[model samples]
Target chain A: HMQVQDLTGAALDYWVATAEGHEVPRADASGCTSIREPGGVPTPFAPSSSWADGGPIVERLPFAGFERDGGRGAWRAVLHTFNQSGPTLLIAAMRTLVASTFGDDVPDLDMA
Target chain B: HMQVQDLTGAALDYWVATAEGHEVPRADASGCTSIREPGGVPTPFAPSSSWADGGPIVERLPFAGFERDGGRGAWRAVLHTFNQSGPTLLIAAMRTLVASTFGDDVPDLDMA
Candidate 1:
């Protein structure tokens, strides 16, 4: 439930050093929202299908199980991380995911 | 210069307006090609690193610098007559012309 920066970067070391599985940063901040909005209901994150604008024609995807839109920036971050990690097998896996999710109708998608 | 719209739609009106950009439309085109047969050199657009088949692996990003792809629906009407003026970005210290320009050792490039 910590903020992105707290869980980001080398500070990840602190969590690893900890005895408790507190080392595993909670990916969800639902608990934090309860405190952040004492009386108000926390904004519900929702599932979204597609979003694009002819202006930039940009595409955004949401985090799995989170109902939020316009996460293209986040996907770009994820893509950059995966690309830098440079595992061919992992890359292949990612390509398969992309094809399955987005190119299911492609003629040769079966070849992959 | 003569072709992605006179050169593909507007007459540049016959060229731009004559065609719908292909139908309000396609957004771009496969671009007309090497019409000459100096006894045989007919091919497709250049620099195309991708091709996908129906009904959709979907993404294909080729055709650059040629000015014929999609016609972009024919911008820059050149008729700087009257209240037709808008602002442009001019850099003071940019007394220079800028011209400039991927990957992998053993390689498979991106997906379609």
Candidate 2:
């Protein structure tokens, strides 16, 4: 199951690009780990936990999903989050992408 | 003066709730600071910057916006970000709110 949300036109394009291909794919081979025990009990890694509560949780494969019609006849992208870290990394990466990709055209994001 | 984007019904409701009223208001005098110089040079506080690049940017008033028609007969919300921290904090706060508000009805977020 996915948590689908409506995205901006620009955002939709960005997610679509990332989905099809991007310089940085969503998954990475560096500094990443599963957030669960072998039995599927989630044991938050210290660093990952700290990232969520105290800092930014950066890791490999923090995102997964696709784009589709949002029922209202507009493009929608579903960003699935396994945990806080997933969205933590995903939104940050998207913020950077929006800044770099759209430049001045990037709408002033009310992000901190 | 806002960066507009579409939101899910649940998300829109959440923002609307915050806008109209919530147990927690948007601003607080807690661990937060302006990300700009007197001249608005936009100095990146180390902690805030680290939160944006290295961790989750959490602070006071990292979000601003209203809900409206997204040009296609759907409810939309515009989230404003002064910096990375704005969206960073806003998203995190919203994530927590969503979880608490909707409980099991909360959609599975594909975040890290």
Candidate 3:
């Protein structure tokens, strides 16, 4: 359900693009097994019990950049996170930005 | 407006990458709408009220994999989202899993 897009050539190049720390995508393939078992049992591969207390609960890093082609350029933001748990209620947030830097005098972005 | 970056190679290994939940800067910001409203009152065909009831959403299942390089590896994806309204703070999230496994070296993202 795409929510936004440019129609008029007036808006573009609004925000920048970004990504964050560790940007590594780790999966089950790492051999680092889940500590908790289905029946609530702790496994051998479980991470250090001390890890929970040794550091912050969650680490959120953000990045952003600018992209331009034809009519206008683009600005985007990206947030990243790693090994962290939280008690805070994360109300699933989403927002849009307007890139007004790249106006409508350039070529089309799709032609590439 | 980028908030952060990796100036030194040491800062490279950091957070994971993620996309927003919707084509919104709309979580409340009602920011920009190049696609949503036509300058609107009635460009309704582009979307649906029913969408909220059954949408796939940005639907990322917290996927990650660490790659290998002389120093580190790479992580990436292509294309990009749609809808829904969320607010409150919903973070409990994954702390790990049972799918213990080993990952291959990460890819060289996009030089093609």
Candidate 4:
């Protein structure tokens, strides 16, 4: 895609905005590689059933799905445009920055 | 302080990172103007008791506090570094972008 160095505020905004209302699959039954529950209770493969399960802690949100990890009691929630992998999200962020900075002059992403 | 036009990838990263572990005041009884619980049920002044209170629907998260608004049952959540105002957050985002792009060549922010 685009170079990370060329990112701009506008491009980031676009990427963030693009994520709005995007569909995100559940981590439990859904075959989503992008989401991770980190270390589960029984094992990394089997995530904790709930936040208070004393296994892998799960934090559920109404809209953005839930986050689970077997680390600490203090939980954090992350919200983003759904269905984007880390690198993909970063690329989209860069694209938004470029467009905001360069407008029509924004360079085409080198997807290859 | 910085221009929206000059934001870059690195600058955004810095801003996002700076927000980590920052303390955010609660919207209820916590004198925080930056956070708004829009269209509160009892009144815009008094937010709902809980998400299921049938007043202003509230979404509670463990770390980032909670979000409340009187509108729909299907709620959404937003996550950021935390404790930053909207414009402040945008400014930080732009800074990160600029820093990542220009590094030492980045221009000084116009704080005046």
Candidate 5:
């Protein structure tokens, strides 16, 4: 993965420290609202639809950077679909998260 | 985004060709089962549990790469929990997708 150009050591450390913990404890609070339903499994960071088209679908959560656009709490993609295929929309989710969080620092992403 | 160092022009073209299409057409068909359920939404490639620990949780789909492991269909990080916070597990999802897709080419990611 490409590291952001200007993140301070402290900033990177702060973020890295977080990596040591669990990323999502709950889905509803984090803006993902489908896991609670029965038979509702997930697909990393891609939407179920991602498999169909070949790109990802995102869900945003509350991050200060995200507030710049919609009040998305975080960006996410999940799968609840069947017979999915293609390049993997999970890439879309990856592209979006990197762009939203590092838009100010990282180069603009080739997002759709 | 960091390009995979070894992808040939044709491989890259084939993948890019996919980006031109819609990512996920149907959740269930794509491995996203929650969307079909009531109040089922997604959080990219992380799991609902991702919100709690502050690190992303992943769901692997049925890709040849994934079959090497537990036969996860694809890598995903969706949220269905509430009150999520900490370092975004979305990064984890991104890291996973990238590593899985280009494990031999891209530098080993700093994933948790």
Candidate 6:
């Protein structure tokens, strides 16, 4: 993705907007709610579970089709994003961070 | 905090070592488990709540007493470290990220 002046802020704002946009598409058995725009790789854009709701541990998720590890910087972006976006998305944001970096594998979302 | 060539790796290594070291001290009613080493401020070092265990949404947590935002970079550090550390600490790492950056507020951990 292209860099921007307020990428972190923008990410959080966009995530909040996305949360309120419409109900996100249902996830598949693999826990993927969305696909990569360019490669069509399955992915999850946000956390479908909270501390109590029951979802993948995120940190427990396996690597996406891509093997690259984005590392702590990726996590830092998410924590900062979560802080700005407020506590409502705390768990969601954490899940998203895991999805964005390693890959999204949310089995619970696929159960339906 | 001094910079290192492998800060992320080192962090994970240290965290794992700490995890295996000894049972962490329990938290107070406010969800704070340990005090800031230098300042004596109470804080939680990891996630006590799993998807089902129940703890404060890291994002839901209020800013620490410092009220300083380390931003996305800080989150990134945690995520990368989590990846290296493996899934066992996924939630714990996520919670730690919040604690390190914004602050730790684990209410469930506080009810000792």
- Total backbone collisions for each predicted model: 20, 28, 47, 19, 89, 17
Per-candidate DockQ versus the true complex?
0.02, 0.05, 0.02, 0.02, 0.02, 0.15
Better of 2 and 6 by lDDT: 6
Q: What tens-digit string does per-residue lDDT give for candidate 6 at B11-108?
A: 32233223333244443334425332544554454343334322343332321211113321111223333321122333334434434533322222
Model 3 per-residue lDDT at B67: 13
Candidate 5 per-residue lDDT, tens place, B5-86, comes to 3332223222222222324212221221112224556322223223321121232222112111121222222222111122
Tell me the tens digit of each residue's lDDT in model 4 across B18-96.
2222132122232112212334322212111111111111112221222212211222222332221112222322332
- Total backbone collisions, model 2: 28
Q: Candidate 4: lDDT over CA atoms?
A: 0.26
Name the regions of candidate 6 deviating beyond 4 angstroms.
Answer: A1-32, A44-89, A92-112, B1-12, B19-112
Candidate number with the higher DockQ (1 or 2): 2
For model 4, residues A34-109, the per-residue Cα lDDT tens digits are 1123342211121111111111111122212222122112333222322111112223223332333344243343
Q: Which residue segments of model 3 deviate by more than 4 Å?
A: A1-30, A36-40, A43-112, B1-83, B88-112
Instruction: Supply the DockQ value of model 1.
Output: 0.02
Estimate every model's Cα lDDT from 0 to 1: 0.18, 0.29, 0.18, 0.26, 0.27, 0.32
DockQ-based CAPRI category assigned to the predicted complex of candidate 3: incorrect
For B4-104, candidate 1 gives per-residue lDDT tens digits of 21121111112211121222211134332332224544333211111111001111111010111122221111111111101110000000000000000
RMSD of each: 20.4, 18.6, 24.5, 20.4, 20.6, 14.7
Ranking by TM-score: 6, 2, 4, 5, 1, 3
Mind giving the per-residue lDDT tens digits that candidate 2 earns over A30-102? Answer: 3212223234532322232244422332212222221211211112222233211123334433433333333
Worst 10 residues of 3 chain B by lDDT: B88-97
True C-alpha contacts between chains kept, each model in order: 0.00, 0.08, 0.00, 0.00, 0.00, 0.31
The candidate that wins on DockQ is: 6
Model 3 C-alpha lDDT per residue in residues B29-108, reported as the tens digit of each score: 22112223334331111011112211111123322211112211221211111111111001101101101110111222
Error of 5 at A90 (Å): 19
For every candidate, the chain B TM-score is 0.16, 0.22, 0.16, 0.20, 0.22, 0.21
**Tens-digit lDDT track for model 3 on A8-86?**
2111111111011112212232222222323443222211111221111111112121111221223222223111111
Interface RMSD of each: 17.7, 11.9, 15.7, 14.8, 16.6, 13.4
